[PDB]
Design an enzyme around this catalytic site. Structure first.
Site, mmCIF file in Angstrom:
data_model
loop_
_atom_site.group_PDB
_atom_site.id
_atom_site.type_symbol
_atom_site.label_atom_id
_atom_site.label_comp_id
_atom_site.label_asym_id
_atom_site.label_seq_id
_atom_site.Cartn_x
_atom_site.Cartn_y
_atom_site.Cartn_z
ATOM 1 N N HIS B 64 0.816 -1.205 0.000
ATOM 2 C CA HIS B 64 0.000 0.000 0.000
ATOM 3 C C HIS B 64 0.856 1.264 0.000
ATOM 4 O O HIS B 64 0.437 2.340 -0.420
ATOM 5 C CB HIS B 64 -0.934 0.052 1.215
ATOM 6 C CG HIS B 64 -1.957 -1.019 1.196
ATOM 7 N ND1 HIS B 64 -2.999 -1.071 0.276
ATOM 8 C CD2 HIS B 64 -2.142 -2.061 2.009
ATOM 9 C CE1 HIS B 64 -3.754 -2.149 0.507
ATOM 10 N NE2 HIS B 64 -3.255 -2.752 1.599
ATOM 11 N N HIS B 89 6.561 8.203 5.028
ATOM 12 C CA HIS B 89 6.177 7.710 3.702
ATOM 13 C C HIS B 89 5.705 8.897 2.884
ATOM 14 O O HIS B 89 5.530 10.002 3.414
ATOM 15 C CB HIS B 89 5.077 6.636 3.860
ATOM 16 C CG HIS B 89 3.832 7.190 4.450
ATOM 17 N ND1 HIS B 89 3.578 7.169 5.782
ATOM 18 C CD2 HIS B 89 2.774 7.863 3.917
ATOM 19 C CE1 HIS B 89 2.443 7.778 6.078
ATOM 20 N NE2 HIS B 89 1.907 8.232 4.910
ATOM 21 N N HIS B 91 3.086 10.327 -0.658
ATOM 22 C CA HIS B 91 1.926 10.167 -1.540
ATOM 23 C C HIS B 91 2.212 10.950 -2.796
ATOM 24 O O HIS B 91 2.816 12.027 -2.743
ATOM 25 C CB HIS B 91 0.689 10.778 -0.862
ATOM 26 C CG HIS B 91 0.325 10.120 0.416
ATOM 27 N ND1 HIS B 91 -0.553 9.060 0.509
ATOM 28 C CD2 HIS B 91 0.751 10.339 1.684
ATOM 29 C CE1 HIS B 91 -0.646 8.657 1.788
ATOM 30 N NE2 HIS B 91 0.143 9.409 2.537
ATOM 31 N N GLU B 102 -2.018 14.949 -0.758
ATOM 32 C CA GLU B 102 -3.277 14.638 -0.110
ATOM 33 C C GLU B 102 -3.995 15.912 0.323
ATOM 34 O O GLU B 102 -5.137 16.185 -0.087
ATOM 35 C CB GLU B 102 -3.051 13.707 1.082
ATOM 36 C CG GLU B 102 -2.401 12.399 0.632
ATOM 37 C CD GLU B 102 -2.939 11.249 1.458
ATOM 38 O OE1 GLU B 102 -2.568 11.147 2.651
ATOM 39 O OE2 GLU B 102 -3.776 10.500 0.923
ATOM 40 N N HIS B 115 4.703 12.371 4.788
ATOM 41 C CA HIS B 115 4.129 12.221 6.132
ATOM 42 C C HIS B 115 5.146 11.571 7.068
ATOM 43 O O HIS B 115 5.696 10.531 6.733
ATOM 44 C CB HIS B 115 2.873 11.344 6.095
ATOM 45 C CG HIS B 115 1.762 12.041 5.400
ATOM 46 N ND1 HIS B 115 0.696 11.342 4.820
ATOM 47 C CD2 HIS B 115 1.555 13.360 5.169
ATOM 48 C CE1 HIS B 115 -0.111 12.270 4.324
ATOM 49 N NE2 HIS B 115 0.386 13.516 4.493
ATOM 50 N N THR B 196 -5.255 8.726 6.614
ATOM 51 C CA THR B 196 -5.807 8.916 5.261
ATOM 52 C C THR B 196 -5.933 7.621 4.501
ATOM 53 O O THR B 196 -6.256 7.629 3.303
ATOM 54 C CB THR B 196 -5.041 9.937 4.452
ATOM 55 O OG1 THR B 196 -3.760 9.381 4.200
ATOM 56 C CG2 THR B 196 -4.905 11.266 5.172
ATOM 57 N N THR B 197 -5.629 6.491 5.160
ATOM 58 C CA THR B 197 -5.829 5.173 4.589
ATOM 59 C C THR B 197 -6.652 4.393 5.583
ATOM 60 O O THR B 197 -6.665 4.706 6.768
ATOM 61 C CB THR B 197 -4.493 4.431 4.434
ATOM 62 O OG1 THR B 197 -3.842 4.297 5.697
ATOM 63 C CG2 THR B 197 -3.560 5.161 3.489
HETATM 64 N N1 LIG Z 1 -1.257 8.994 5.454
HETATM 65 S S1 LIG Z 1 -1.224 8.086 6.863
HETATM 66 O O1 LIG Z 1 -0.106 8.542 7.658
HETATM 67 O O2 LIG Z 1 -2.557 8.099 7.424
HETATM 68 C C1 LIG Z 1 -0.912 6.390 6.406
HETATM 69 C C2 LIG Z 1 -0.682 5.914 5.122
HETATM 70 F F1 LIG Z 1 -0.673 6.707 4.052
HETATM 71 C C3 LIG Z 1 -0.455 4.561 4.877
HETATM 72 F F2 LIG Z 1 -0.246 4.156 3.629
HETATM 73 C C4 LIG Z 1 -0.457 3.634 5.915
HETATM 74 C C5 LIG Z 1 -0.651 4.062 7.233
HETATM 75 C C6 LIG Z 1 -0.883 5.446 7.436
HETATM 76 F F3 LIG Z 1 -1.069 5.904 8.673
HETATM 77 N N2 LIG Z 1 -0.677 3.135 8.258
HETATM 78 C C7 LIG Z 1 -1.678 3.267 9.327
HETATM 79 C C8 LIG Z 1 -1.220 3.184 10.760
HETATM 80 C C9 LIG Z 1 -0.261 4.066 11.268
HETATM 81 C C10 LIG Z 1 0.140 3.996 12.596
HETATM 82 C C11 LIG Z 1 -0.425 3.043 13.434
HETATM 83 C C12 LIG Z 1 -1.395 2.175 12.950
HETATM 84 C C13 LIG Z 1 -1.803 2.237 11.617
HETATM 85 C C14 LIG Z 1 0.134 1.930 8.151
HETATM 86 C C15 LIG Z 1 -0.491 1.096 7.068
HETATM 87 S S2 LIG Z 1 -0.218 1.913 5.531
HETATM 88 O O3 LIG Z 1 -1.225 1.496 4.571
HETATM 89 O O4 LIG Z 1 1.175 1.719 5.240
HETATM 90 ZN ZN LIG Z 2 0.314 9.407 4.554
#
Ligand SMILES: NS(=O)(=O)c1c(F)c(F)c2c(c1F)N(Cc1ccccc1)CCS2(=O)=O
Ligand SMILES: [Zn+2]
Ligand SMILES: NS(=O)(=O)c1c(F)c(F)c2c(c1F)N(Cc1ccccc1)CCS2(=O)=O
Ligand SMILES: [Zn+2]
Lengths: 259, 260
Positions: B64, B89, B91, B102, B115, B196-197
């Site tokens: 992802h 990471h 976007h 985003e 982010h 955001t995911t």
């Molecule tokens: N933009 S964002 O910061 O919201 C965001 C994102 F873009 C992601 F692609 C992913 C996120 C993620 F935050 N996570 C989620 C998460 C964070 C920390 C504790 C638990 C779960 C991890 C799974 S992911 O699909 O790699």
């Molecule tokens: Zn993100």
């Protein structure tokens, strides 16, 4: 379904699968994706001058305030005749008065008018056309705040009488073409969807280039006159922010009748 | 198998992940009508961001996202609690449309967005635990414009060829993560929002810096063409492109540390 809370637009696709499908509207109209198309000839608005001796029903259906239109009203200039069924509006709220559905170069207009039509050459009614090939055509007028608009007031003067879901008012016929902007020959055209459930991807959109104006007071009346609940609901809901967010639109063009 | 495109794309996330259809969702459009200056928004302090060049940090493609893992000794100070970094990471868009931020500002998209995800390490042992707690997470966002070549971002981007597929991992030598931040970090937007995911938990304190950074067209093209969401042996490959969520209704105000 609603525009907020847990039954808002991100959850429409649960009950209405097309809302998570292809060709969804509205979209941002921006220079990189526009392409002039000489085939986009002026539309002709026939039967729009509604008999002043007739009355047309205005409704609040809890999702929308709509004006019913007669099927002798139609667009000419598409491959088939498209007959009118209704018009309605979308808007924001007094604290953020930017509630058009389509955007232009990322910017919302204050509000947006839609005149819904269906292919009456192929289909018997809009409901039946809505899930069908070439079924629907919607005209969109972008609205900005400016001088008072007597023509829009022919609708807006009735809004108090349709404040609550289920209420209805009669509107005497007037010339609906008065709601259209200057230089209707200039428009954006693309294939998209209804912007509300069931979100069917069966709409030929025509978004006029030029906006109309309504006054500060008319916009505020539109944004504050209507609830999305019945009169006896102990938890009333203002009808505000009744627009869908723009959708991704990748590897596609919007055709323009102007260069 | 959520995605950013097709029947598992963002309008369908809520079918499996209820919070994606709930309140306080991100990202949002930053525009005048919803901004308000807040003089209480004092500068953050970035502690332990200067990672040793002699250490190495794991870069992983999870299908992802491609994330760089960060050490918990990296902190932001200024927030009521101390927050420790967990990962960063990006976007982005695609080669034919390099508009994949985003957050948007006055309705425009930036080229990309970085982010840096933190969790409240005063209260919780790890970011997964923090993620379902109020203000459990704090994410810093940097808007990225197409512009000059950026050697600091290239310290990440030069390894992306080596994590092209889901499940692949690579090591990145440490560098000073504060090099990824823009000028005048004291100027920022602050609001309460969400991941955001999926699972879209509404547990994030967002800080979006006011000023963007630049990376080059060539860096954007490399980013937009290097990566896949799918395993190396998958017979139906999917490019990791257009990995941004549309902006959300703002149900909120956004508070600014700058008044003009
Ligand atoms: N933009 S964002 O910061 O919201 C965001 C994102 F873009 C992601 F692609 C992913 C996120 C993620 F935050 N996570 C989620 C998460 C964070 C920390 C504790 C638990 C779960 C991890 C799974 S992911 O699909 O790699
Ligand atoms: Zn993100
Ligand atoms: N913006 S729009 O043109 O897509 C739109 C809209 F905003 C609505 F509020 C409604 C629409 C509607 F189109 N319909 C849907 C439909 C049309 C014609 C054949 C069948 C169903 C009727 C139900 S509604 O909730 O009043
Ligand atoms: Zn409409």
């Amino acid at each position: 379904w609603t525009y907020f809370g847990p039954d808002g637009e991100n959850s429409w696709s649960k009950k209405y699968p097309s809302c998570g499908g292809l060709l969804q509207s509205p979209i941002d109209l921006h220079s990189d994706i526009l392409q002039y198309d000489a085939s986009l000839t002026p539309l002709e608005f026939q039967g729009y001058n509604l008999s002043a001796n007739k009355q047309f029903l205005l409704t609040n259906n809890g999702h929308s305030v709509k004006l019913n239109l007669p099927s002798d009203m139609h667009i000419q200039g598409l491959q088939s005749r498209y007959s009118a069924t209704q018009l309605h509006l979308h808007w924001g709220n007094p604290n953020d008065p930017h509630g058009s559905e389509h955007t232009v170069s990322g910017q919302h207009f204050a509000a947006e008018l839609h005149i819904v039509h269906y292919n009456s050459d192929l289909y018997p009614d809009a409901s039946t056309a809505s899930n069908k090939s070439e079924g629907l055509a919607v005209l969109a007028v972008l609205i900005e705040m400016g001088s008072f608009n007597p023509s829009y007031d022919k609708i807006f003067s009735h809004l108090q009488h349709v404040k609550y879901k289920g209420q209805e008012a009669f509107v005497p016929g007037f010339n609906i073409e008065e709601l259209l902007p200057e230089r209707t020959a200039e428009y954006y055209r693309y294939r998209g969807s209804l912007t509300t459930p069931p979100c069917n991807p069966t709409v030929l959109w025509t978004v006029f280039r030029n906006p109309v104006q309504i006054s500060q007071e008319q916009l505020l009346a539109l944004e504050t006159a209507l609830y999305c609940t019945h009169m006896d609901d102990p938890s009333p809901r203002e009808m505000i922010n009744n627009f869908r967010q723009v959708q991704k639109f990748d590897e596609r063009l919007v055709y323009t009748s102007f260069s």
